[PDB]
Amino acid sequence: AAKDVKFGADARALMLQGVDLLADAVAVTMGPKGRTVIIEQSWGSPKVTKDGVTVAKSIDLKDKYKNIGAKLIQDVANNTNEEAGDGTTTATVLARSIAKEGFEKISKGANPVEIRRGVMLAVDAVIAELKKQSKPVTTPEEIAQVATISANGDKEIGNIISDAMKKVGRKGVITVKDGKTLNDELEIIEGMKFDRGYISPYFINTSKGQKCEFQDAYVLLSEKKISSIQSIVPALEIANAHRKPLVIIAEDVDGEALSTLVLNRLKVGLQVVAVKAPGFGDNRKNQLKDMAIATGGAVFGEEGLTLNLEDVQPHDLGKVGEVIVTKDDAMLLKGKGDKAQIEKRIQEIIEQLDVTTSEYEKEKLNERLAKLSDGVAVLKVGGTSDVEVNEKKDRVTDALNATRAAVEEGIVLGGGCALLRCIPALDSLTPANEDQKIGIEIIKRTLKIPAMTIAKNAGVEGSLIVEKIMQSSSEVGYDAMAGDFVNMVEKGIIDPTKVVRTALLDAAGVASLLTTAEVVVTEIPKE
Amino acid sequence: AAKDVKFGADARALMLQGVDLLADAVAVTMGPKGRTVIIEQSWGSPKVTKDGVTVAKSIDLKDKYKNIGAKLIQDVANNTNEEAGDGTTTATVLARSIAKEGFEKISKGANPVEIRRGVMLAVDAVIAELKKQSKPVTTPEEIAQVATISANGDKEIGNIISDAMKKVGRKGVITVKDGKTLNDELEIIEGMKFDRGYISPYFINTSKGQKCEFQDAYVLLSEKKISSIQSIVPALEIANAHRKPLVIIAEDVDGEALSTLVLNRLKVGLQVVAVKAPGFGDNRKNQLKDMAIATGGAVFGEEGLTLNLEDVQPHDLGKVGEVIVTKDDAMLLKGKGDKAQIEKRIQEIIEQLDVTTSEYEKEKLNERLAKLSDGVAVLKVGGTSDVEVNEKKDRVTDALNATRAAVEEGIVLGGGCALLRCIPALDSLTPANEDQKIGIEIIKRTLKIPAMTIAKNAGVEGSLIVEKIMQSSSEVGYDAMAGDFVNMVEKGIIDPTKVVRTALLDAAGVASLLTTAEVVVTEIPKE
Amino acid sequence: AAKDVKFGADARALMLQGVDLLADAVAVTMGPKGRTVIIEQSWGSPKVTKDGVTVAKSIDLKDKYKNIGAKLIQDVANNTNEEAGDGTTTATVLARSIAKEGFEKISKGANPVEIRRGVMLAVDAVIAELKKQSKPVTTPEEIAQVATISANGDKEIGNIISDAMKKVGRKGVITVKDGKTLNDELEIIEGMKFDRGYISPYFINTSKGQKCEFQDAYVLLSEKKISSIQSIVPALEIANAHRKPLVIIAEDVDGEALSTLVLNRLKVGLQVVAVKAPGFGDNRKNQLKDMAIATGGAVFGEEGLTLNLEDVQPHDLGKVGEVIVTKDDAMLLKGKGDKAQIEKRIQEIIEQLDVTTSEYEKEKLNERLAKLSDGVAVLKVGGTSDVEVNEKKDRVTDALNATRAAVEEGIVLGGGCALLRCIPALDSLTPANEDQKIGIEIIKRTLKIPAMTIAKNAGVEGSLIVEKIMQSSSEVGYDAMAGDFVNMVEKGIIDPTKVVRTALLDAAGVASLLTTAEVVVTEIPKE
Numbered sequence A, B, C: 001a002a003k004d005v006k007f008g009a010d011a012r013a014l015m016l017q018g019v020d021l022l023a024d025a026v027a028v029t030m031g032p033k034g035r036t037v038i039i040e041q042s043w044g045s046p047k048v049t050k051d052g053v054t055v056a057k058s059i060d061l062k063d064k065y066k067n068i069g070a071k072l073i074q075d076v077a078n079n080t081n082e083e084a085g086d087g088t089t090t091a092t093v094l095a096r097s098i099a100k101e102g103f104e105k106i107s108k109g110a111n112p113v114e115i116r117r118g119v120m121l122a123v124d125a126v127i128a129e130l131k132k133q134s135k136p137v138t139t140p141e142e143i144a145q146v147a148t149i150s151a152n153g154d155k156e157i158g159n160i161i162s163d164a165m166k167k168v169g170r171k172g173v174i175t176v177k178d179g180k181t182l183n184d185e186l187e188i189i190e191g192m193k194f195d196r197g198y199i200s201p202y203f204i205n206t207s208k209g210q211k212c213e214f215q216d217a218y219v220l221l222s223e224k225k226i227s228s229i230q231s232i233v234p235a236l237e238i239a240n241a242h243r244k245p246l247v248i249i250a251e252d253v254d255g256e257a258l259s260t261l262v263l264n265r266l267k268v269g270l271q272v273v274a275v276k277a278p279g280f281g282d283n284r285k286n287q288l289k290d291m292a293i294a295t296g297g298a299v300f301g302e303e304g305l306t307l308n309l310e311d312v313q314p315h316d317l318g319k320v321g322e323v324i325v326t327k328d329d330a331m332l333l334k335g336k337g338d339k340a341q342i343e344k345r346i347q348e349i350i351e352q353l354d355v356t357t358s359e360y361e362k363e364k365l366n367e368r369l370a371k372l373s374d375g376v377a378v379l380k381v382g383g384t385s386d387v388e389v390n391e392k393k394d395r396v397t398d399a400l401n402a403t404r405a406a407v408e409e410g411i412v413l414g415g416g417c418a419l420l421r422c423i424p425a426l427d428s429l430t431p432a433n434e435d436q437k438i439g440i441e442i443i444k445r446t447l448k449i450p451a452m453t454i455a456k457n458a459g460v461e462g463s464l465i466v467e468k469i470m471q472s473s474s475e476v477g478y479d480a481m482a483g484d485f486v487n488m489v490e491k492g493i494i495d496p497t498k499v500v501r502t503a504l505l506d507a508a509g510v511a512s513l514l515t516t517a518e519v520v521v522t523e524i525p526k527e
C-alpha cells in the first residue's frame, strides 16, 4: 500500500483543523443552555442526543489527516466516559485547548517532550489541590442536587433517584429500562447481587442484552465443587420433571459436568445455568446459608448435617421467581423462603454485629444484611416516541453515574468554578527550565476553558464572566441558567470530584502526547 | 464511512424544506373536500389512497438532510396511527406548524429546552381542557354519525357498522375482508380471537398489511415449550405431505426450533407460523383445550393422559378454515370441531360460573364463553376493481377505528372546532420566564391549523372562517361540505376525544424535540 | 429508495399523455373496418392480433408518470376481459373519454368526489335503462348473427358455432384446438362434464395447459369418502396389473390416501388422479350412478346392495377412453357402458320429468339428460402458418364468449347505438348540486364515443353519423361495413347486453376514481 508522508507545520495544521471541527461539533451541547445534535441512523429514525461521547463517536472525516485528530479526540472522550461515566464534553474542550496551545508553542528551539513533562507536573498539582478541596456527601438533599444537576436540571429525575437510593441504600442496585407510559415510574423488587457471573457463555438464552434470564428457577447450592456426573444428573431430572429452570451455585464446575450441562441445554433444552459461589471460606458458607434461607433451600457439602448431591430431592432445592445472569454478575430476585428463617438469620447477624469490633467482620455482616434486605430497584423512563425516550434514558443514566461517583468520593463547586480556584496552586511550582514553564503556562491558560464555554453557550461574554468569578470570594460563582452570581453550594450547583479529575487527567495525557508530533504517515486512498 | 457536519441555519432550513414537502403532500387529503394521492407500486397497479399515514410512509428524499425531517414526520404519523388509528393528517399538520414556529423563534439568547418545556405545559393544559369538555355516547345514532363522519361522509358504511355493532355488541370482534360483488354485505361467523402476536416476523406471506394469511390450515398445540427438533419434525412432515398450511400454538419456541422452522419455510416453502400461547397457568390450559375442541385436535404435554409431540398423527391435530395473524393479535375463525363437545364444555363452563363468586374466575369464564359463543362479524366491501376496493377498505378501517375510539371515550365537536374552544384555557397559565411564554404562544398559534386547513381545502379563506367561528357561540361551527355555519351536535359533525388528544400529544412531543437541534451529522453519499 | 413528488396539473398532464398513447394504440382495431397490431415476441415470430386486451397488456412506457395511466387502462381492459370476455376496446375508449373529461373539469372550487358520485349515479341509471331495453334470444338465426358479428364478419365461424350449439345444446361444451389443415372442422365427441377439479396439483402429467390427460383409464366411484388405505390399495394393484390409468371420483380423499397416491405416482409411475364428487346429497348419488352406468362401472358405498371397496374387482370398475382434468373442471369423454342401461336411464329420467312439477327437480333432470346425451364439441381452426391461425383462434374465442353471453342474457342493438338511445334516460335525473350535474354531463358526453370511433375508423365523420342516427327512429342505425343507414335488427347487427354493461361499468368505475387525484409519487430511475 502506497503511503504519503507530511513534514512540519502542514500536518499540524491539518490535524488541528480536524480537532477543531470535532470539538466545535461536540461543545455546542455543554452547559444548562446547550442544544442537541441530530445523528442520522442507517436502519431507521435519526437519533437526537445531548451526550458528548455519543456525538464524538459518530464523526468520521474523509480526509486522512484530519481523521487522526478526530480519532484522538474520540479516544479522549471514550476513555473519560469509561473511567468516570460523565464529563466527556469537558474532556473534549480541555483536549482541544491543550492541543491548540501546544501546536502554537512549537518552534525550532522548543523541546515538546519537556513541555509534556511540565504539563503532567501541573496536572498532578491541580489534581492534588482538587482532592484537598473536596468534601464528602452526608445528606439526601446533596444526592438530589447532584442528580438534578447531572440530569440537565430535571428535578423529577433527581427526586426519583434520591427516593430509589433511600429505599435500596447508597450501595443498592438501580437499573434503567424503557417504559410504556408517559411518566417515569419506580418499582422496588426484592433481590440480591452476589458479584459472580456465569461460568460458561453457553447458558445465554437471548440475543439482546447478552444475559441469561430464567423464570421460576430452582436453586442448587453446593459448598464443594461438583465433579461426579451422578451428583448432578438427578437434579437435572428433577428440574426437567417439573418443567422448571435450574440454577447451579457451587464452588466450581469441572470440565465433564460443564460439558454435560451444555450438551443437555443445547440438545434437550433444559434451562440450566451454573455460576461461581461468591465468598471465600467462612464467608462462602455464610452466604450459601443466606441464599438457602432466603429461597427456602439447603446448602450441600456442609460438614454439619451433610446432605449429598447424589440424593437431591425436589424439596431440598430453593425456588427463585426470576434470575438474571451476566458476565460480570448475577441476581436472584424473589425467593420462596419462610419469613421465620429469614428473621432468625437477620437477628443472628444483628447480634453478631455487636459481638466483635473489627472492620472485616462488621463489613461482611453489613454486606449480608444489605443483600438480604435492600434488594434492587428498576427505573422506567416514559415518553410518547422512541427518540425522546432514548434522550431521557441517556440523561437518567448520566445522572445515575454522576450520583454514584459523588457517593464514592467527595463533591466540589460546579459550573466550572472548581478548576478556576485551583489556578493559585500552579504558583507554587518551580520549573526546571523554560520548557516546563511553557507547559505550566499552557495548563494555566487551559484551566479557564469550561467556565468560558458554559458562559458562551448561555449567550454572554465568557471572558468578563470568568474575570468577575476570579475577583469574587471562594464560594461565589456564576449561575448560567439564572444569569446571576450566587452561592454555588447553597443553590446546589455541585459536581463530583472524580469526574472532574478524570476528565482533566485524560485530556492532558492525550493532548500533551499529541502536541509532540513532527511527521505524519497516512495511506493513499484507493479507488 | 465519512460523514458531513452542518451547523446553524443551514441544517434547520434543509430539514424544514423536507418537512414542508412531506406535509404539503400529506395535507391535500384533509377534510370532506380533500383529494387523493396516487402511489406507484413496483409489483403491480398503482395504489390510490386518502389515508394520511399511508401517504407519509411512502415519501423518501434523495437529500440526506431533508430525509431527517421526513423521517421525523413519518414517526409522528406512525405513532398517531398505532395509538389511535385515525387523525394522522391532523398530527402531521400540527407537527409542521410547531416545527416552523420553533425554527422561527430561535435566536442567540433563546433557550430551546425551556421553549420545549413551555410547549409541553401548554399541551398538557389543552389536553386537560379537552378531557373536561368531552361527553359520552349513549345512542346508536351517535355511533352512526361518528362512523359516517370518519368514512368521508359515506352513510352506508356508517349504517352497516352501526348494525354490526348492534348485532355483535359494542365490544365484539369485527373484521374487514375483500368482497366479490358490487355492494357491501355483513355476515356473522363464529370464531375466537386469542390476543397474541407472532413469534418471528419471517412468517409473513403477504406484501400488504403486515399479516400472516393461511387458508385451510392445521392446528398444533403444546402445553409445554417446544425444544427438541425431533418433537416437531413429524408435524412438519404431515403439513408438507398433506400440502396444506400448518399453525403451531406453543408456550414458546426456542432458537433451534425457530431456526429449523424459518429455514424450512424459506427453502421448502412450508406455510408454518408459530405464536405465543395466550394466558398463563390454569387459564393457559383452559384456553388451549378451548381451541383444541374448537379445532377438533388434541392438547400436547398435559400431565393427565400425556401425548407426546414426537408421535403426532393427523387425527391428534385440528383444522381451521382461515388464519389471520399480526404482530399484536391473531385469530382462527372457522374450526372443524364437532358441536357436541363444544356444547358440553359450554354447559360445564356455565355451571362453573355458578360454583364460585369471584371477580377473577367469573371474568375468565365470561371471556371463555364469549370466545366460544359470540363469534365475529366480517365486513365485505364491494367494487369493480382492486384499486377502489382498497380505497374503500382504508375508509372502512378508519371508520371502525374511530367508532371504537368513540365508544371507549367521549366525543367532541368536529371540524377542528374542539381545539379552537380550548384556546382560552391557555390564558390561565403563568410562564416562569420568556421561553415558556414563547412556547405557549407557539402552541396558541398552532391550535388554529386544522380548521384553517379544512377550510383551505374547500376553496375558501381559512382565516376568515376561523375568525367568524371564534366570534360565534360555543355550539356553532363551519360545515365544510355545505358551506354554512351550523350547529355541530345537531348536524352530527363530531370526533372522538382520544384521536384528537393523541394527535396533539404526539405532534407536540416530536416537533418540540426536533426544534432544539443545532448540529446535524449525515453520512456522505456513496457511488 | 429516493422518490419524486409532483403536484397539480403536471402529474395530470403526464398521466393523460400516457392514457392517450395507450388508447390511441388500442382504438385503431375497433369496428368492422379496424386494422391489426403487430407485437414483437422475444422468443420467435411476431404476434399479429386484433384483440383490445392483448394490445393493451403489451404496452409499457419508460416514463414513470405515463406508466401509471397505462397501468390503469390495462386494469380496465383486463377486468372487462375477465368479466364478460368481450368489449375491451369499448372499455378502453370509454375510460379515456371519462378521464379526459374529468381532467378538463377540475378547478379550484370543484369537488372531484361529488363528481365521481354523480358519474356512478348516471352509470347506474344508464345500466338500468339498458337492462330494460334488453330482449332475449329465441332462434338459431340470432345466434348465427351474434357469432358472425363478434367474429369480425366471418360467416363461416358463425355457422360453425351455430351448428355446434345445435348439436350439443345451448349449454353444451365447446373447445378450440390448433388445426393441421387449411379449413375449419367441427367434431362431436360423446362425454360428460361435472364441474369439479382435481384435489392435488401433483397429478399433472404435462407441461403445457396445466391439465392431466389419461387415455383408456379405469373408473372408480365412491359414495362416501375414502379413508382406509386397504380400501384403495387393491384398486391401484388392479390398475397396475392391467397397465391402465386410474381415475377416482369420491366425495373426498383424506390426507393419508392422497399422500399415498402422490408418492406412488411419483415413484412407481402409476397414472392416478383424484377429483371431487359432483353434486350434493341425492344429486351426488344420482350423478355418481349416471356416470357409473355411462362408463359401465358401479358406485361404492351405496346403502342399498352395498359393494365394499376392499374387495374391488376389475369388472366393478368402469372404463373410459380418455380423461381431461384441470383446476376448475374435468371431462370423461368415451365411456364403455352398455347402451341398454343408458337408454333405460334416459327413459326413467324422462318419466320422472313428468311425475313432479318443480324447478329444482326439473333442472336437475335436464342437466342429467344433457350430460348423458349431448357430449362435447371440439372446434379445429385451420390455416397455413401459425400467425394467422393464432389470429383466427382469437376471433373464434371472442365469438364463443359473445355467443355464451348472448345466450345467458338478452341482446341489444349493435354498432354502438345501444348507448346512444340511453342518453334521454339521463334527462330524468335531478342532481343534488353542481358537481353531480358535472358528472352526469361527463357521462352524457361520454356515451357517444363508441359510435364516433366506429364511424371514424370507416373513413367518415363520426359527428355527422351520430347526429343523423339520433334524429332517426329507434330501430335505425349505421352500417359501417356498407355505409348505409339500415334497420339494425333486420340486418343482424346486434350485441349482447352483458358485454355493453360490463364495459361501461368497468370503464366508469376506474376512470372516475382516477380523475380525483392530486399528488403522484414515483421512484427515481436507477442507472
Ligand SMILES: Nc1ncnc2c1ncn2[C@@H]1O[C@H](COP(=O)(O)OP(=O)(O)OP(=O)(O)O)[C@@H](O)[C@H]1O
Pocket: A029, A030, A031, A032, A034, A050, A051, A052, A053, A085, A086, A087, A088, A089, A090, A091, A149, A150, A398, A413, A414, A415, A416, A454, A478, A479, A480, A481, A482, A493, A494, A495
Ligand atoms: N445551572 C447551572 N449553572 C451553571 N453551571 C451549571 C448549571 N447546571 C450545570 N452546570 C455545569 O455545567 C456542566 C454540565 O455539562 P454537561 O452535563 O452538559 O456535560 P459534561 O459534564 O461535560 O458531560 P456529558 O456530556 O457526558 O453529560 C457541569 O460542569 C455542571 O456543573
Ligand SMILES: Nc1ncnc2c1ncn2[C@@H]1O[C@H](COP(=O)(O)OP(=O)(O)OP(=O)(O)O)[C@@H](O)[C@H]1O
Pocket: B029, B030, B031, B032, B034, B050, B051, B052, B053, B085, B086, B087, B088, B089, B090, B091, B149, B150, B152, B398, B413, B414, B415, B416, B454, B478, B479, B480, B481, B482, B493, B494, B495
Ligand atoms: N362535513 C364536514 N364539515 C366539517 N368538518 C368535517 C366534515 N367531515 C369531517 N370533518 C372533519 O375533518 C376532519 C377529517 O379528517 P380526515 O378524514 O381528512 O383525516 P384524519 O382524521 O386526519 O385522519 P386519516 O387521514 O388518517 O383518516 C375531522 O377533524 C372531522 O371532524
Ligand SMILES: Nc1ncnc2c1ncn2[C@@H]1O[C@H](COP(=O)(O)OP(=O)(O)OP(=O)(O)O)[C@@H](O)[C@H]1O
Pocket: C029, C030, C031, C032, C034, C050, C051, C052, C053, C085, C086, C087, C088, C089, C090, C091, C149, C150, C152, C398, C413, C414, C415, C416, C450, C454, C478, C479, C480, C481, C493, C494, C495
Ligand atoms: N357491420 C357493422 N356495422 C357497424 N357496427 C358494427 C358492425 N359489426 C360490428 N359492429 C360493432 O362494432 C363493435 C365491434 O368491436 P370490436 O369487435 O372491434 O371490439 P370489442 O367488441 O370492443 O372487443 P375486442 O377488441 O375485445 O374484441 C361492436 O360494438 C359491434 O356492435
Ligand SMILES: [K+]
Pocket: A029, A030, A031, A034, A050, A051, A052, A089
Ligand atoms: K453535553
Ligand SMILES: [K+]
Pocket: B029, B030, B031, B034, B050, B051, B052, B089
Ligand atoms: K386524509
Ligand SMILES: [K+]
Pocket: C029, C030, C031, C034, C050, C051, C052, C089
Ligand atoms: K378490436
Ligand SMILES: [Mg+2]
Pocket: A086, A087, A150, A398
Ligand atoms: Mg453531564
Ligand SMILES: [Mg+2]
Pocket: B086, B087, B150, B398, B402
Ligand atoms: Mg379519519
Ligand SMILES: [Mg+2]
Pocket: C086, C087, C150, C398
Ligand atoms: Mg368483439
